[PDB]
Design a protein around this ligand. Structure first.
Ligand SMILES: Nc1nc2c(ncn2[C@@H]2O[C@H](COP(=O)(O)OP(=O)(O)OP(=O)(O)O)[C@@H](O)[C@H]2O)c(=O)[nH]1
Ligand SMILES: [Mg+2]
Length: 660
């Protein structure tokens, strides 16, 4: 009684998560009718991006109430594009419910969520959906055992003439059939009894083996009570030693409430994870929905709260005059919150994702769940469409990054572009759409390549600056030798004190400044050693400015005599692709001026290692799917700069010259 559970519902895209969530909200009476993803009427999927793309872009909270018990279910995204929200939902929960389609089995997205849950130390339960589409549940159980390990079948499917109509609860040897979401007990079919019995024996044995007390009794032949077995089961799941497998479909309305009862029976309470104590909470996500302002979503891990209470935070006291539990986009006021609750805090402009809140002694890192977000690796250059957009862009981006810290916004020092980094093509599309929701039209372009320049031969010469302005003049005289080198180097080789040492810093500054814009095509210059070997000064007119200029003039003159050449960045490209698709991958890489370094095999898959010019793969992320039938994956990492083939170089050099 009064039990509470916090659970993240994760799984590969399209595994039936939101549909199950809708069914749970409907069956518990939280809403009048079960909405549908295909009609845009679900509680979770309410933002324009979620509905347009028919996928959960943003985690939705479903605060389920059932017979006085509460399950705060976090309906999370399926696509890796939304890793931010997925990891945030897992961070916020005490267990993971992993949806697996009976048609597809464990998919890449299933494994990703499973792994994150494992690293967080979270118990896991599997719910098998879509069996109505025709799959083999028994083969799926074997596959789950092979891939995930200690699974524990709770349910087996009840069929009538080949049609899936219900559940056989292995433990109790009872069956239930459904007609229009309504359940009635049925008999376990005669032809199924022996198999059902086998599974029951297997389940009993798996549970007994996890408890020293029960294990002792079984070896001796003593009786094991149902109560003892229930407690052992709960304890084993709590420790991640058994993974219950349930069967339910929100589309066919089969096994929905039984799944909720199993969540309560099998998954841990907040007290079982954190113990009792002072309030401990964390902002696991943030929404800045148009016309709503910033709302911070808080998981209360421990403690209890009443309206008017306050929590400490790195930004000072956070008062909560009103407590609200979120249901999708709605905030429902409550009069108390206990550990396990997820709260929605409105007017939360000062509360950011990842912020820890507490009472008493501040927590250290080991006390707060944390799932690191991998850096976004897909860049696009951002451009406001017009005047109105440029004026509104800064604030819209501020809102976008508050809501989604998995994006990275950076001013590319070298090329001058404003870059937005995301986790995939879909991720970036949803960001563009979100900026549009905020009233700003932006366009994405392929980022400019940071070309550079260097020299091929030694050269030397003079840089001199002498002028008089008013009653004070200027004088700088520098002799500079430039030599090709693997890395930058500055050498002071002044002799006889012809230039005082106090001007060394200014001279190096001037060389570095001129090196920012090479003589070949105006790109930063690298790969040279600069030697200052002679020069002169005048006590009166000499200064740092005169020497910075003289040094810059010397650099420009000398680099031009040093046979300058264009360089481009080269990246290491790893591509994982089906064996039958390898030919297209290589064929295409060859057209991208790629250099195959070698290949490895991972099943019918093969890993292709190559080096390719960054300029040939800035949109590789868009082409990979078509080249690998959607099964491919890739990683790009900077390797080194290399001279641009004479043909390309000329055209690039010409382009830069022609305009600018
Ligand atoms: N036949 C059948 N269809 C289902 C079942 N569950 C869900 N669907 C359908 O599967 C499609 C996707 O369902 P969703 O609930 O959006 O799946 P999801 O896991 O939330 O998807 P993402 O949020 O994109 O990761 C929709 O057409 C649902 O109607 C099921 O058990 N049987
Ligand atoms: Mg969904």
């Amino acid at each position: 009684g009064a039990m509470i559970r916090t659970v993240a519902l994760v799984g590969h895209a399209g595994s039936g998560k939101t549909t199950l969530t809708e069914a749970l909200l409907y069956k518990t009476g939280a809403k009048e009718r079960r909405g549908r993803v295909e009609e845009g009427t679900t509680t979770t999927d309410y933002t324009p991006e979620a509905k347009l793309h028919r996928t959960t872009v943003r985690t939705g909270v479903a605060p389920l109430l059932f017979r006085g018990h509460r399950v705060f279910l976090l309906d999370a995204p399926g696509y890796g594009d939304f890793v931010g929200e997925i990891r945030g939902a897992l961070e916020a929960a005490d267990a993971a419910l992993v949806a697996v389609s009976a048609e597809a089995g464990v998919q890449v997205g299933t494994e990703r969520a499973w792994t994150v849950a494992e690293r967080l130390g979270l118990p896991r339960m599997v719910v098998v959906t879509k069996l109505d589409k025709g799959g083999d549940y028994y083969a799926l159980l074997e596959d789950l055992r092979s891939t995930l390990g200690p699974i524990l079948p709770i349910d087996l499917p009840l069929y009538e003439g080949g049609k899936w109509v219900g559940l056989i609860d292995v433990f109790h040897g009872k069956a239930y059939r459904y007609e229009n979401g309504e359940e009635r007990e049925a008999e376990v079919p005669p032809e199924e009894r022996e198999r059902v019995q086998r599974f029951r024996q297997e389940v009993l044995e798996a549970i007994v083996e996890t408890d020293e007390g029960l294990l002792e009794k079984y070896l001796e032949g003593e009786e094991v009570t149902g109560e003892a077995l229930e407690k052992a089961f709960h304890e084993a799941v709590r420790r991640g030693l058994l993974y219950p497998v349930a069967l339910a479909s929100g589309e066919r309305e089969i096994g929905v409430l039984p799944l909720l009862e199993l969540i309560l029976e099998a998954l841990p309470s907040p007290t079982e994870r954190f113990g009792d104590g002072p309030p401990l909470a964390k902002v696991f996500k943030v929404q800045v929905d148009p016309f709503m302002g910033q709302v911070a979503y808080l998981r209360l891990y421990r403690g209890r709260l009443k309206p008017g209470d306050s929590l400490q935070s790195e930004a000072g006291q956070v008062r909560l005059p009103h407590l609200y539990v979120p249901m999708g986009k709605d905030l429902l006021e409550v009069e108390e919150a206990e550990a396990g609750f997820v709260l929605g805090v409105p007017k939360a402009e000062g509360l950011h994702r990842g912020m820890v809140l507490w009472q008493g002694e501040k927590p250290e890192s080991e006390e707060v769940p944390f799932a690191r977000l991998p850096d976004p690796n897909v860049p696009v250059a951002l451009h406001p469409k017009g005047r109105t957009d440029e004026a509104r862009l800064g604030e819209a981006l501020r809102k976008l990054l508050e809501e989604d810290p998995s994006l990275k916004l950076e001013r590319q020092e070298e090329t001058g572009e404003l870059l937005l980094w995301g986790h995939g093509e879909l991720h970036l599309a949803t960001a563009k759409e979100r900026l549009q929701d905020y009233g700003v039209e932006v366009e994405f372009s392929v980022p400019k390549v940071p070309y550079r320049e260097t020299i091929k031969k030694v050269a030397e010469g003079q840089g001199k600056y002498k002028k008089q302005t008013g009653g004070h003049g200027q004088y700088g005289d520098v002799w500079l030798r430039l030599e090709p080198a693997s890395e930058y180097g500055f050498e002071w080789r002044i002799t006889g004190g012809v230039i005082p040492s106090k001007y060394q810093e200014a001279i190096e500054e001037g060389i570095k400044e001129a090196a920012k814009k090479g003589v070949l095509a105006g790109f930063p210059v690298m790969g040279f050693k600069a030697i200052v070997y002679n020069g002169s000064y005048h006590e009166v007119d000499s200064s740092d400015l005169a020497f910075q200029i003289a040094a810059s003039l010397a650099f420009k003159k000398v680099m031009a005599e040093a046979h300058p050449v264009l360089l481009e960045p080269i990246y290491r490209l790893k591509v994982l692709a089906p064996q039958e698709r390898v030919g297209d991958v290589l064929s295409d890489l060859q057209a991208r001026r790629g250099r195959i370094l070698g290949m490895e095999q991972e099943g019918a898959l093969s890993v292709v290692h190559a080096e390719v010019p960054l300029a040939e793969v800035l949109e590789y992320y868009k082409a990979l799917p078509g080249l690998t039938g959607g099964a491919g994956a890739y990683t790009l990492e900077f390797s080194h700069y290399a001279e641009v083939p004479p043909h390309l170089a000329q055209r690039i050099v010409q382009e830069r010259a022609q305009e600018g």
